[PDB]
Design a protein around this ligand. Structure first.
Ligand SMILES: [Mg+2]
Ligand SMILES: [Mg+2]
Ligand SMILES: [Mg+2]
Ligand SMILES: [Mg+2]
Ligand SMILES: [Mg+2]
Ligand SMILES: [Mg+2]
Ligand SMILES: [Mg+2]
Ligand SMILES: [Mg+2]
Ligand SMILES: [Mg+2]
Ligand SMILES: [Mg+2]
Ligand SMILES: [Mg+2]
Ligand SMILES: [Mg+2]
Lengths: 177, 136, 54, 104
RNA sequence: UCACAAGGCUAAAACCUUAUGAAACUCCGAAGGGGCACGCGUUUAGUCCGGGAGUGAGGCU
RNA sequence: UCCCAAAAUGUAACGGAGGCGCCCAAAGGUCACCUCAAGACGGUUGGAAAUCGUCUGUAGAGCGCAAAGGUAGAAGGUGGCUUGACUGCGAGACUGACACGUCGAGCAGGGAGGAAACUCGGGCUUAGUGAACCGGUGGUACCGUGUGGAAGGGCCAUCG
RNA sequence: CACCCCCGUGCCCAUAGCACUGUGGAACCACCCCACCCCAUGCCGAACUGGGUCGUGAAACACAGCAGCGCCAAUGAUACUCGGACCGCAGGGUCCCGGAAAAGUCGGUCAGCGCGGGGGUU
């Protein structure tokens, strides 16, 4: 919510650091994107009941069931079946869930000195998915079964990777050293 | 020699040779004169022939290649019931088309290794040297 | 058609009218399992709705 | 993408229907509803809005849709076929419609 | 699209230079061929309706 | 269906490959909306391939099955309502020795989706079929023998 | 269309395309702002869409530069070929006379033609 005005603490934090021509010409962050991709093996009604409750309580948003891209390799695969779950979070609820992260997700991480600062989207965007589920403000072991993990990808209108780097970091992000 | 997988079967026709009538890969090059067919063994022949002559070992460019399935019916049947199983394989070498390029040996080695090569084939032949310069 | 075929059985559509009429087509029987409700014309009037008769 | 516009553009079977194409541009807050014989590469009506609209924004619809249909009835052009482009037909351009659907 | 001659290069597949084969390959593509029109310039046939058929084993360059 | 088939249709072979005798109640009518295969980077199970993300991206995909032609302004992918997989017809043509077979504007009765102009008498198309005869069945009241009735028969439908 | 220029739309279906690039903001476009209901997401105002600005010229769009790529492409010459003739047992080949590509080379090109509208030329 307030992270809005924080974005606006960044707007000339780099418009005065860089030397841009304009204020819209500085990297915004369209959507955060969450992928709960069990799949390959896990074909139970219960783990998608669970992935549903989980996603819909943590980000307060209905989850879309992404299916088998007709990819039926040698192993256990076929055509019309859930091999990945998705919840796109953008703007408002994006800023809210990302704040849920930096506030009540990032410290909660068991063993954590920051995350991977190597050049992500060579176009200058980002991803970062992360294992563990037992590091949360919403995901409780007292409200789940066994352990899962998330996979997240944030999009940043940066031109290059140093500019996304800077963006993400001045926004409230730890880059391990 | 033979190929890997394909269609299976064929037919035949003639009229002059497309490309490549030019001396690439080598300094010296032997060139067909007759609208032949040529077989796996007919060329492996010249492989082993010239490869005798050059010793260790030259540099030998077989510019031709068998891709044609030729058949023969089972011996002794009256025609009908089929087309012949695939007897052997054929490179459909037309004239002016160049079959062999070598270098990494001298002029004498080209003359002779090509002589011995061409004494193994259904064709009169001429050996020569480069200058065909449309594209190296 | 081909007698001992159990799916796509050929059955007719008798009018709810009672005109004295029937259409004729083919349900997969791995589908309906109860009957069929269709809305075809009927020369002896105009627009009946038909029950998939035995 | 473009798709939708060119889709409707061809489902207006260019001239072969006989009638008259009716454009729109409700994607800005300056629109452009037009009238075309499409076969003849000419335009025959023209209800703009950039030379002072009224004051309204999407209420302006029925109004330039009444101005157009007026310039139409004046020209003589008494029959419709409704082009669009990327537009749903529901609200704004739907108003333009209703008040052109009885407005000329 | 299947094939395949050398070489590059990487972890080979791709892809670059060099390179070629195809009835079931086709960026390309004639000569001819066919329909319609005209007859601008020659020549004789055509088409319909009704009677009688025979032929329906073909052969060679 | 594809070469063979000599750039028009056609054409044989105990010549060269392959497929059909169904399927679809939605996979049809309409209305609206969405765009594909892959490769690179980067990412929890994974990690050749799964899911997500971005840059590339005119077809290198998809069409229930065979391939060829076709297709991205959709025929491909998703929903809303739906029974045009409709009777009475048939201008005009493709095709065949015949019998068949194929396409079809438009008219009527009467509908379906659109707000509309519209579109539809089955599916992208070309395989998914059997002439007569004898008989079953649902209508129909044309024939029924001195007469009026009924058997039986005809006509439309249809089943083997 | 009076001159430029922008908005919608067509004939033309790449000598009209892409990338590299510079111009471009109240004058149109776009982003942007918010959305409880219209209306919509197989989840989300991302998109369809309802409220309206400033703001930004960035992105997208429009214009201009640009021959690196794509596209287009000669003449000459050849292949093949109608029809005249012929040679070789044959695989095949020649002669006369016309038609005559493909690919390559010369090069050529940031299209060209409309209608209506809005908006400016102290
Ligand atoms: Mg070219
Ligand atoms: Mg006979
Ligand atoms: Mg004969
Ligand atoms: Mg012919
Ligand atoms: Mg014959
Ligand atoms: Mg009999
Ligand atoms: Mg009866
Ligand atoms: Mg009776
Ligand atoms: Mg001749
Ligand atoms: Mg000549
Ligand atoms: Mg010429
Ligand atoms: Mg330009």
């Amino acid at each position: 919510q307030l992270k809005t005005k924080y974005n606006d603490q960044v707007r000339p934090a780099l418009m005065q650091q860089f030397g841009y021509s304009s204020v819209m010409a500085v990297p915004r962050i369209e959507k955060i994107v969450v992928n709960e991709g069990l799949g390959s093996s896990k074909e139970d009604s219960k783990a998608i009941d669970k992935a549903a409750k989980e996603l819909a309580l943590i980000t307060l948003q209905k989850p879309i069931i992404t299916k088998a891209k007709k990819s039926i390799s040698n192993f256990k695969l076929r055509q019309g079946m859930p091999v990945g779950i998705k919840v796109t979070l953008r703007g408002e609820r994006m800023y809210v869930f990302l704040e849920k992260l930096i506030n009540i997700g990032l410290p909660r991480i068991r063993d954590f000195r920051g995350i991977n600062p190597n050049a992500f989207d060579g176009r200058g965007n980002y991803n970062l998915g992360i294992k563990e589920q037992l590091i949360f403000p919403e995901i409780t072991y007292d409200m789940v079964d066994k352990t899962r993990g998330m996979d997240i990808t944030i999009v940043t209108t940066a031109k290059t990777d140093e500019e996304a780097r800077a963006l993400l970091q001045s926004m409230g992000l730890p880059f391990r050293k | 020699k033979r190929t890997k997988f394909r269609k299976q079967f064929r037919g035949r026709m003639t009229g002059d040779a497309k490309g490549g009538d030019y001396v690439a890969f080598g300094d010296y090059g032997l060139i067909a004169m007759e609208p032949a067919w040529i077989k796996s063994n007919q060329i492996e022949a010249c492989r082993i022939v010239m490869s005798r002559h050059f010793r260790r070992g030259g540099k030998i460019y077989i510019r031709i290649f068998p891709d044609k399935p030729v058949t023969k019916k089972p011996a002794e049947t009256r025609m009908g019931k089929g087309k012949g199983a695939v007897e052997y394989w054929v490179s459909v070498v037309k004239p002016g088309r160049v079959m062999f390029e070598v270098a990494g040996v001298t002029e004498e080695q080209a003359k002779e290794a090509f002589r011995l090569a061409g004494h193994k084939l259904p064709i009169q032949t001429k050996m020569v040297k480069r200058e065909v310069y449309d594209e190296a | 058609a081909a007698a001992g075929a159990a799916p796509r059985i050929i059955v007719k559509m008798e009018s709810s009218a009672g005109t004295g009429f029937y259409y004729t087509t083919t349900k997969n029987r791995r589908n309906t399992q109860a009957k069929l409700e269709l809305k075809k014309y009927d020369p002896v009037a105009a627009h009946v709705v038909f029950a998939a008769a035995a | 993408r473009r798709k939708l516009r060119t889709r409707r553009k061809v489902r207006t079977t260019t001239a072969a229907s006989g009638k008259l194409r009716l454009s729109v541009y409700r994607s800005s807050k300056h629109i452009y509803a037009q009238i075309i014989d499409d076969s003849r590469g000419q335009t025959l009506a023209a209800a703009s809005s950039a030379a002072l609209k009224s004051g309204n924004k999407t209420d302006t619809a029925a109004a330039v849709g009444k101005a157009l249909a007026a310039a139409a009835a004046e020209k003589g052009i008494k029959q419709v076929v409704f082009d669009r482009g990327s537009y749903k037909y529901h609200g704004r351009v739907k108003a333009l419609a209703d008040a052109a659907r009885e407005g000329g």
